[PDB]
């Protein structure tokens, strides 16, 4: 009765994550957010195995065009990768220095289907009746970067639920130059905590700082059916 | 049987066949996406949404708030996977029944397990994991971009990200006027070959031709057995 | 343990068919316009069904460990109903007559959506039985090129009720929802009267004849 | 002595306008707003002679690309032109029928410089001391259409203020099809009447209906030094 | 006198005065660009159009096709040149906005006025027959979020601002009447090429704190003597 | 003298000359525009803003709100008018001092009157009206477009909309990496030839391989007397 479900988990750290109990490990790699080719942002869902690429590069793609010509690292494209918990540098990191800033991931095989549930409150949402829990975290929706840079996660996908909450969860890698850095044009979007409001109330402007941010972020849980 | 379905594209005027141990539901034409109101929304080449039973240069219509609908009255586009047919030396847009020679064909096949796609990031064709059966192999197709409308992309685990034949111009653009052609801004992105030692080295600039697939990543789609 | 998502396109909450078990209900979310970027949700997937409603249910966080709520001009988009369009943005509680409801169910086998590109309802493949029928919903735009589209395999590309303006725009910071003239929808066309590979015959359709030019579709599940 | 300043006036009607005062008429033509080529909107300022095209066409431009190839009416480009006071049709008008919908213009030579002043109130502003008035109207700032369609006029240019206030002041012409029509995606932006507010008060939401629109638009006057 | 207009921006809360025998025509507030219907329409900072007499967070009216207009009914924004005041922690509203809006003035000059750039840390000397009016830093482009923004003509005096700030403008939500700064705001200034050879590869540099002013190109606004 | 200035572009590696009754202020490199943060803002090829005294593939830098500035650290572009020099058959980006062969040169000239540009929309080079003196003639250049960043355009009355030599690819793209090249998405738009009888006929499709002057509008720039 095994159907062949594949799950993707991101450690958000320098260490490679491990598969859940009785899960067959398929491959490991690096967490890819999206590729900005020809000023168009194409994302890979963090809950899909496509977001876990085993071999890293600041430019893992090449472009082909008219007259049967293909080009690798011949223009001004960039790539975006999920970051770790390393300290944010003051200047773009170079070549091997990037390894401590790129998140690790793992793709495994699961027997039953896997979804993600969000509470939109400070409380952790419960899995549906009959479903077991895998891990918990914070509801991660969409993101925006430089230029047309952007993308988002499907709310039912495990990519919509990251373990750690990070104000700076991704990094921009200059493709042809091979350097990565964080920029102020980066913005992360999380589902909001709506416990102190009514479903049809007008939102009140609030500037949340330091430690108080974790209390305003929606919680989530990644579940599988038993 | 639960009946997970997928799509296969021949990239030619001939209809492809469903692989082993899968049943054919219907055949059609390879639809890559649509560009309405200067926005390119794409169909996943692995899903049935990329296999329309009937072909037309304008498969949709717009409807505004005054309860009126316009069909082919303004300038919107459609996108289809293309054949290896060379465009005429006059390099004029193709119209009429000569369009049969340029629109790829497809099939939609149902199977009892799920279908994934693995990319090797090298010249070696990746093997299917334990318990998985090989269906077809190809080249890692990431996305395609147009000018000022964005682009259409593929999920790296969908079989649509694994085209059986490499093309510098795999997608052709059709207009509501009833004509199709290649246009210079049409680009195609593919996963490159990355050796394990080049993972954190500055990428080297290189302009290849079409036949030089040595820089194009290989891929393999796989179904599961029992 | 496969999950189907259905949208009522009305103020009523939809119910699961036959032996499909409810998991949760909520509101039909189309896409969010955060920082001048549109992120869409698959109308046929559970992600488009959010339990709690809000004109701005997201939080914007920057780099310097500071977040901002309702501090810019981001907006939200929801599947609307067939209620009467007002003259000014609706506010507070009366906006609920313009928000569709949804529900997530569990199905035994896989569920897909097939399109006919004709005025006829397409028949489900061999071994499949139909769940509901509707109209091929392809793309949508709100202003400029901001909008999105549906996967033609997902049930989200198949809506039961056809309206030229199937969504509503909610200003998040001001907490108001409204319709606008720039909103346009895109539906698959009826190709029964066309000649193959010919140039499309342009048509300006009005009133009740519009439904005759919309492609039909059916959401099917396998035994 | 005369330095060589050129002024441009658009009639917004089916008749060609005549130059004011003792200014020498240089040429007449049709009122062009902007050209949407390759889904990019490039505008000609309505106060600049480039906005007055003597010979009309739904596609008065052609595109050139790689390999020294140029193409005319070979894609899906469109043009936008200032309208007259004709009745809005039910379907896109074809070929000769479009002439009754295209505004006429004239380009003249002036001895001294010409600018435009806006009052942001219901009252028509007076020219600065020493400058004489040419015509009055309603302050027209920017515009938005389908896709990436848009543009605007500089507030010092005479193009920033058209005589008539029109909710539908421009029309979209399908380039290759040779047909023009109005669409609901068209939006006009006028300078607002700020007599009932103070410079830092929050704007009040207002829904203006038939006939009430002319009262909320700023007035202007285009002035020249004698 | 021909009637040529020069525009000066104070970059502060004070209204500037015209130099020498230049006659004032009007004063006002420094307008950068308007974001109407997700479209950015810029004003030349060196032209009188960028100097608007009346301030408002939304001085425009949006009108559609069906003879109905809407004011403060969407999410349109306005952008103004800010001052050297301290950036707050939450959006300022109502009257406290006046400390964040630059002031401007329009004057009449006898001869033509231009702006020359040095691309170096040195102030460029005006050509033979020209005398300098003020000096400053080469202001090229600006973006607020994504690719929304604009740029300045390098001949216009708007490309030459006397005071250099990393975030020289402020964003005002029109419908709610609130103005604020954001982290995604970026400015673009011409670089200091004093240590470079004409066709060398650019030396990438991450400059911080007060040294940023040492890497900005200098400029001077010149007017010719008759 | 009031001193109205304009710019002239040779579209070659050699510096052009100022026309009659104009004085040379400075010479430089033909700047067409810049593409920062995926937004292409162009310079008017008739104004002095299109004539930079020094050339570089990245003439600007970004500065954020944390009071730091990055120069050539990310991926932004610049645009320059190009020469008729053929790109190498290897069709690889040009870097180093070989970029001299591909960047156009320019001059900025001051005169006592104003400069206009007339477009004929036909094959005939239009003559300027009474009281105007002819400086140079050329072909009607409307705009250039790139992929997903918009494009850069010229005002049809500015002399920048009148290039003395027609080019299918008049603009070259340079990156912060220090190289320039032509890219397939780079397109150029020109005013077409429209006969008086073709004003309201549906346009007929035509793909030109050669003999381009039959379809390209002629233009002329002139100063006043
Ligand atoms: Ca770019
Ligand atoms: Ca288009
Ligand atoms: Cl690159
Ligand atoms: Cl907001
Ligand atoms: Cl066209
Ligand atoms: Cl608004």
Residue numbers in the entry:
A (entry chain C), D (entry chain F): 2 to 227
B (entry chain B), E (entry chain D): 3 to 228
C (entry chain A): 5 to 227
F (entry chain E): 3 to 227
Task: Quote the study's own text.
Collagen IV is an essential structural protein in all metazoans. It provides a scaffold for the assembly of basement membranes, a specialized form of extracellular matrix, which anchors and signals cells and provides microscale tensile strength. We solved the crystal structure of the NC1 hexamer, determined the chain composition of protomers, and found that Drosophila adapted an evolutionarily unique mechanism of scaffold assembly that requires divalent cations.
We used Drosophila pellet to extract and purify endogenous NC1 hexamer as described in Experimental procedures. We were able to obtain diffracting crystals of tissue-extracted NC1 hexamer (at 2.98 Å resolution) and CVC trimer (at 1.75 Å resolution) and solved their atomic structures. RMSD of superimposed recombinant and tissue-extracted structures of Drosophila NC1 hexamer is 0.43 Å between 1346 pruned atom pairs (across all 1351 pairs: 0.47 Å). A slight difference between CVC hexamer and tissue-extracted hexamer might be due to extra linkers and FLAG-tag sequences in CVC and sulfilimine cross-links in tissue-extracted hexamer. Out of 12 chloride ions found at the hexamer interface in mammals only four were found in Drosophila. In the solved crystal structures, we indeed observed four pairs of double salt bridges from R76(1626) of each Cg25c to either E173(1723) of Cg25c or E175(1685) of Vkg.
